[PDB]
Subunit: 272 residues, 3 copies
């Protein structure tokens, strides 16, 4: 695999949240999607532009303790500081003991681990999280990828009942990365669509016995993903996605997957 390099900056946002960006002044919440193929190495030249200590910690991928992003492993970044974090990945294969070593591929995420507390409770609450996809050779690639983060009671830190909404055309392969943070369990639900509860969100064939679900319980720092064919068997329309914990949806943990016809039109709907 490739040796890759990116720049990342942690920035306080003008509304007082915090976010990672590929350029100065271009921070988003969630942070930018990082995509790698198993075997790729990624060196992230990270700069903490804030006036508090901040770090970068990744789930699932291979890193040494010097890229833990923790105070425990002396690998957080002082205010205005820089640090190069290195993520590695490996393909699956047979160990000499006969057992099978699981590859890095999966739907993963990165987050701050020092803002607020030694577990990143404040950086997480403020926005310092983002998605990482590690692909296996042969994995099917999508038309679009959309990241949905249930961070305490907000989606992608948006106010109640304020999306995000994602648009697609009927028939598109659409990938969703679904990450959870904070204090609460949630249940992720999409109307109109369903996926397999396995690595890729898709059944490998008729012999794959994976649960096919449209609703999935998640807790802080869980991540999974899937791909659907937009509107498959169900048509164009505004397909809600939402936490299914009753008060959480009532409180605004709801967005719309807007699946349009190939003429760009959608059946009329009446949003909040």
């Amino acid at each position: 695999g490739e040796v890759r390099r990116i720049k990342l900056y942690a920035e306080r946002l003008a509304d007082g949240q915090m976010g990672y960006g590929l350029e100065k002044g271009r921070a988003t919440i969630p942070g930018p999607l990082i995509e790698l193929n198993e075997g790729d190495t990624l060196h992230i030249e990270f700069e903490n532009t804030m006036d508090v200590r901040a770090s970068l910690n990744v789930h699932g991928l291979d890193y040494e303790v010097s890229s833990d992003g923790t105070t425990l492993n002396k690998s957080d970044v002082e205010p205005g500081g820089t640090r190069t974090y290195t993520w590695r990945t490996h393909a699956p294969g047979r160990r000499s003991d006969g057992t099978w070593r699981a590859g890095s591929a999966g739907y993963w995420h990165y987050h701050d681990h020092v803002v607020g507390t030694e577990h990143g409770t404040g950086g997480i609450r403020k926005g310092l999280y983002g998605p990482v996809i590690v692909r296996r050779k042969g994995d099917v690639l999508p038309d679009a990828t959309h990241t949905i983060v249930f961070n305490d009671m907000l989606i992608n830190n948006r106010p109640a009942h304020s999306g995000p909404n994602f648009e697609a055309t009927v028939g598109d392969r659409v990938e969703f990365v679904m990450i959870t943070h904070g204090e609460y369990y949630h249940t992720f639900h999409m109307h109109g669509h369903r996926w397999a509860d396995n690595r890729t969100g898709m059944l490998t064939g008729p012999d794959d016995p994976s649960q096919v679900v449209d609703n999935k319980i998640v807790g802080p720092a869980d991540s999974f993903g899937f791909q659907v064919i937009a509107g498959e068997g169900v048509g164009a329309g505004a397909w809600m996605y939402h936490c299914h914990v009753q008060s959480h949806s009532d409180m605004g943990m709801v967005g719309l997957f807007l699946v349009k016809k190939t003429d760009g039109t959608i059946p009329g709907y009446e949003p909040h």
Copy 2:
């Protein structure tokens, strides 16, 4: 598959509850079990007999936004009104991009989406939910199917400490459909029995790596199901199922799977004293 048609009614029930039924005055909580084979279409002629808008939304099955049963899609039903919902299903198959399209088969459920709030919070609380099983060709069919709904701190909206209990005889192939609703997470456990955490609850063969469990965390709107051979390897008796969150079980989220010997009896079952 085949085109099927049923009538369904939503009605108020005593004590502030609401339910679906196949005929007026026969609503139940949970609502009627709907069972389809992959490829079947079901048209439900739904009548809302209540004085507030109500709907039917289903998980897992195929439906267009005109049968979403949501305010968003203007597909709920006014007081006294009727609407025909359509649920479709499909078998799995290979797509022209080379991927495998997952079939409709599974343990699913339907519920109201507009009573109380535009997420049906009031209607689900009150009893407007029921089970839907879609079978795949070749699926093994059970001797009996029992539905267990954890709705907040109640089972099937029954008073705390009131079951339900289900009976079977050793060797029967008993299916359970387990649905959760409301605000709380739970952990569903059964004494003496275990199942696979996969589509059918049964391992497919020696090649199926699915987890074998007797305890499963669930949250609002999760549904799963399984079949067990009653008493297999463990014999007759009163086998508890309960939520394993400790205060939940202590507050009464418990029921009995009552497994009889083939002679009719349940060991240890002594409801009555004896002289002497």
Copy 3:
């Protein structure tokens, strides 16, 4: 499989705690690891040394109602009493009707069912729980097995911020059994290591579609386990494991997997 016999005791410990042990005065929380192979039968001669009734209930394994360990099935133990519980286990196989019967193998656990309430709420809170592993023929055996119990907001009933920590050398095959109890859901997370969300925690080979995770939601009475190669592709170090529920990790539900180089050293850490 073989017939095995053991003794087990329930005792009070300090601080109003209660524990199971394989010898008097040797109760521990979690209780002793019990390991069987599918087919084995285990007869446990259990003595309740305490002054309240107590019992032994197990998840996963085959038992008759006489060993349910509940008041419902008249199988708890009077103060100072003794009872022999029997656990059986079976291999997987095909039924006469061609359906596949799942085996007893997995990562399971035993606990009291009558202390405090008829669901063992106080017995669990106070420490009456432990791990059982049932192995399948051909399963790989580890170098060490560590048990991590999330019991409400404590790990293994230990005070906040007091581990437990577990040590290995780079390359050791280390097995974890993770059991949760009480009132709360948690998410179990381990730095620098991952596992398959299936029975063994290891993929069966190139066809097994199980998700590979490093973070897993669990609730009361859930149990799972896995093996890793310590430090694989990431090296020696102080690798945290913790609940990832943010207040729970802030309140001290954290431990270290201390993975040492072969010369016994470990990159300097800041606990």
